[PDB]
Design a protein around this motif. Structure first.
Motif, short mmCIF file in Angstrom:
data_model
loop_
_atom_site.label_atom_id
_atom_site.label_comp_id
_atom_site.label_asym_id
_atom_site.label_seq_id
_atom_site.Cartn_x
_atom_site.Cartn_y
_atom_site.Cartn_z
N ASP A 146 17.59 32.25 38.07
CA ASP A 146 16.59 31.94 38.33
C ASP A 146 15.70 32.24 39.09
O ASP A 146 15.11 31.67 40.75
CB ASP A 146 16.54 30.59 37.93
N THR A 171 12.53 34.95 35.03
CA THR A 171 14.06 35.77 34.36
C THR A 171 13.32 33.69 33.34
O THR A 171 14.52 33.63 33.23
CB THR A 171 14.85 35.57 35.18
N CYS A 172 12.43 33.51 32.99
CA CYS A 172 12.76 32.49 32.34
C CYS A 172 13.38 32.54 31.10
O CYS A 172 13.46 33.64 30.69
CB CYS A 172 11.36 31.57 31.28
N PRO A 173 14.12 31.57 30.52
CA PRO A 173 14.88 30.75 30.92
C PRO A 173 15.25 30.06 31.59
O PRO A 173 15.86 31.27 32.61
CB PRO A 173 14.95 29.47 28.99
N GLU A 211 19.95 27.99 32.25
CA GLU A 211 20.69 28.78 30.86
C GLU A 211 21.98 28.05 31.27
O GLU A 211 22.73 28.36 32.76
CB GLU A 211 20.13 29.58 30.95
CA LIG Z 1 16.63 33.42 32.89
#
Ligand SMILES: [Ca+2]
Ligand SMILES: [Ca+2]
Length: 266
Positions: free
Chosen positions: A198, A261-263, A266
């Protein structure tokens, strides 16, 4: 879980301070081994909260990162800003400084007599670090100790050490930075971090090397994004995801470049 405070809004995040009154504890440089600083901690709260070390890292600093102290602590964090002119300097020493600062907070947290005794969840540590302190932050992020990292205009000598950072890392890059030029520092540092991590890269438009320090033209971005980063990752507070994952960040005048690096989570 660790959620604290109301459902966030942009204005809530961009307000000059968060909801909590912030008390401070001055730390002499003679204790803690990190150059002294100021612990900021909210009042009126219950339970434990994440702790964040905010470390400078530019020896000729005309100003420092102290804005982050009251700003972040007022949203429900124990936030210690480290003083400048500490004898620490290069990113490896800054990582040591951060670790000493984190030790100090945890030590004081573990004290029955600290004004913020028991206030810190030791499992939820963040580091905000400017310049060579941003290199130090990335190094500590790589060491695995912390749960969120916000390098501010980071300076370091190599991105290779950052190639396995798994710590949620928001790099504030300062577009016009000539001290830690983004193309040689914040950008490759960000790109070194695995895309599985993230992470976010927020280049602040026209930012000088000081652009991430707060108390400046970028308060909105630093507060909205940086507090959200800490909320989302240190508090696992998904209510702050909306400010990090979703918005067309580069549409903001103040944000010259966004990568992420959304989402997350996870
Ligand atoms: Ca991601
Ligand atoms: Ca520009």
């Amino acid at each position: 879980g660790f959620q604290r405070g109301p459902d966030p809004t942009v204005s809530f995040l961009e307000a000059s301070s968060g909801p909590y009154s912030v008390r401070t504890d001055n730390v002499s440089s003679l204790v803690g081994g990190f150059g002294g600083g100021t612990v900021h901690y909210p009042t009126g709260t219950t339970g434990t909260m994440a702790a964040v070390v905010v470390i400078p890292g530019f020896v000729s600093a005309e100003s420092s990162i102290e804005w982050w102290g009251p700003k972040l602590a007022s949203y429900g964090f124990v936030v210690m800003t480290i003083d400048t002119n500490s004898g620490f300097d290069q990113p490896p020493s800054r990582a040591t400084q951060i670790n000493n600062a984190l030790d100090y907070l945890l030590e004081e947290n573990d004290s029955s007599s600290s004004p913020y005794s028991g206030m810190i969840d030791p499992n939820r540590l963040g580091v905000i670090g400017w310049s060579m302190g941003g290199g130090g932050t990335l190094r500590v992020a790589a060491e695995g100790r912390i749960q969120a990292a916000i390098p501010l205009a980071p300076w370091d000598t190599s991105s290779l050490r950052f190639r396995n950072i798994e710590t949620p890392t928001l790099i504030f890059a300062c577009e016009s930075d000539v001290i830690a030029p983004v193309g040689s520092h914040a950008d490759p540092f960000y790109e070194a971090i695995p895309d599985s991590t993230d992470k976010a890269f927020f280049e602040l438009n026209n930012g000088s090397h000081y652009c991430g320090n707060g108390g400046n033209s970028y308060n909105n971005e630093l507060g909205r994004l940086g507090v959200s980063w800490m909320k989302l990752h240190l508090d696992q507070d998904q209510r702050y995801n909306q400010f990090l994952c979703g918005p067309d960040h580069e549409d903001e005048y103040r944000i010259s470049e966004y990568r992420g690096t959304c989402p997350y989570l996870e």
